Amino acid sequence: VKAPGFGDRRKAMLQDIATLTGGTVISEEIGMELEKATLEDLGQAKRVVINKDTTTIIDGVGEEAAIQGRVAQIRQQIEEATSDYDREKLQERVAKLAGGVAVIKVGAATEVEMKEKKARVEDALHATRAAVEEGVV
Amino acid sequence: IRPLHDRVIVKRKEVETKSAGGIVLTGSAAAKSTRGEVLAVGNGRILENGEVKPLDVKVGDIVIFNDGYGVKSEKIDNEEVLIMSESDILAI
Amino acid sequence: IRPLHDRVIVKRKEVETKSAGGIVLTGSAAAKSTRGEVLAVGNGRILENGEVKPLDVKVGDIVIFNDGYGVKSEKIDNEEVLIMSESDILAI
Amino acid sequence: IRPLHDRVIVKRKEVETKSAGGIVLTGSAAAKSTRGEVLAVGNGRILENGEVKPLDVKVGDIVIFNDGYGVKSEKIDNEEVLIMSESDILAI
Amino acid sequence: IRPLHDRVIVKRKEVETKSAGGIVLTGSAAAKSTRGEVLAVGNGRILENGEVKPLDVKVGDIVIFNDGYGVKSEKIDNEEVLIMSESDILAI
């Protein structure tokens, strides 16, 4: 496969996968040729499944305490992210390590309606998130 | 095996000593390696007509050489091996 | 058939030998093949006047050679035969 | 490091010796250095067939040599040690 | 400054000799000077195995030479000491 993302967002997600799977990232920026990666450097999973646009790794066979330490380290960076745009390109990755991703497939009777529906589904997701951090009255 | 006159058959050391300061580590600059072990040697050199005049190296020498196109390169059942004209060998 | 001195005629062995990985298949990369197998050896080498000079290869050797501009080809009964000089031949 | 015929082995003195003006400290300005402290001398010169002929240089001298195509560098004791021909050497 | 056979050593004379006109002075245009004066001569010329054959030049003579790439230069006493072949030298 080609990698997800662009800039060092690419490097970051490749190292997230490495610590989930128990593998090693090989880079010229760590001064090693790929010509020599070992039977100790290869990451492992309970299964992997691929299609035209996405790849799903089903459970890490890497070191459990290092997997959890990675999940904790991404949440540590969420609490010091140098912008809201930084806080996005960190928060994407905590759920993708800790369990996966949920998707609401939106439906409506017209396209003007599909857009108000999609807007209300965002606005209620933002409002429920806001309730989870500060409570309800 | 059997070298076909003027030729020396060797194998090169690995590329670059990654510890060459004493303690200091390095990656690769992307050179090659001048040191090789001699594996087999030709009869000598035919031209100049006065006999086949013999080469200066022997089997089990550790030679230093000019790593250019007069050195040829090969892979025998996974082993790195090389075959030069003697005129690229600089020293034992 | 008889080569006109210094020249040697060979069949090539397999090109970028696609099975040579172990279990794994290899595809192609833009090498060709260093391994030849000899069909006809010349009338010596007419230089230096103290007779014609020898050639050391024979018909029925399997030979390692250099893929340089000295390597030519020719057409026997519709098959290819490679024609180089012994100055490209390295070892057996 | 036994030099392999015609070749000589020398360690070059400090390139651009920053004091070539007299009292005045002239610096780096695009020069090299030509003076080599001799460490080894080759197995004579073997071409021309009339046995082996000598070289006129010797171990422990400081020779004058050009920064020529025969000049290669190499490593003994963490020094730079250089190999070249009697043709790359100019004088004493 | 003993030149190491075939080579010869001289001092160069006046650069673009500004008195080579007459009553009128000639300028500089970035040539150099073919006129020299010999400081030392080499051992002779070796090749063809029988000892050494002579050079026709001699120590101290006010010789004329082709001021080009055969001619090298070097730094005894902060002179320019020219180190050429005899084959650079045209006439006395």
Which domains are assigned to chain C?
1-92 (2.30.33.40)
Supply B72's token pair.
């040829």
**Does B76 contact chain C (CB < 8 Å)?**
no
Contact C66, C37 (CB under 8 A): no
Task: Answer yes or no: do E1 and D53 touch at CB < 8 A.
Answer: no
Here the tokens at position C46 are 């007419």
DSSP string for residues in C50-63: SSPBP----TT-EE
Q: How was this structure determined?
A: cryo-EM
Note whether D5 contacts B56, CB cutoff 8 Å: yes
Alpha-carbon torsion (B53, B57, B60, B64), positive or negative: negative
Chain D hits for E43, Cβ within 8 Å: 56
Query: CA-CA distance, B81 to B37, in Å (whole number)?
Result: 10
Tell me the angle at which helices A84-98 and A64-78 cross, rounded to the nearest 10 degrees.
160
Contact residues on chain D for E52, CB-CB shorter than 8 A: none
For residues A73 and A62, what is the distance between their CA atoms, to the nearest angstrom?
Answer: 16
Distance CA C58, CA C34 (A): 17
Mutation target vs E (from D51, D56, D61, D87; most E CBs, 10 A cutoff): D56
> Closest to C89 (Cβ–Cβ): which among B1, B4, B9?
B4
Which of C34, C53, C56 is opposite residue B4, by nearest beta carbon?
A: C56
Distance from the B74 Cα atom to the nearest Cα atom in chain D, whole angstroms: 24
Cβ distance B91 to D7 less than 8 Å, yes or no, reads yes
User: Closest to D4 (Cβ–Cβ): which among B49, B51, B90?
Assistant: B90
- Residue A99 DSSP code: T
Asked whether C57 and C20 are in contact (CB, 8 A), the reply is no
**Beta bridge partner(s), residue B71:** B84
Report the helix count and the strand count for chain E, using DSSP H and E: 0, 6
D46, D47, D83 member nearest B90 (Cβ) = D83
Helix, strand, coil proportions of chain A in percent (round to 5)?
A: 55, 10, 35
Separation CA A43–CA A16 (nearest Å): 11
Contact by Cβ (8 Å): B60, B39: no
CA B19 vs CA A31, C32, D1, D26: distances in Å: 14, 37, 22, 36
- Residue E87 dihedral angles phi and psi, to the nearest 5°: -65, -15
Q: Assess D90–E contact: CB distance below 8 Å, yes or no.
A: yes
Listed resolution, Å? 7.7
Mutation site for C-interface testing, chosen from B7, B49, B72 by largest number of C Cβ within 10 Å: B72
Angle (nearest 5°) at CA B36 between B31 and B40: 140
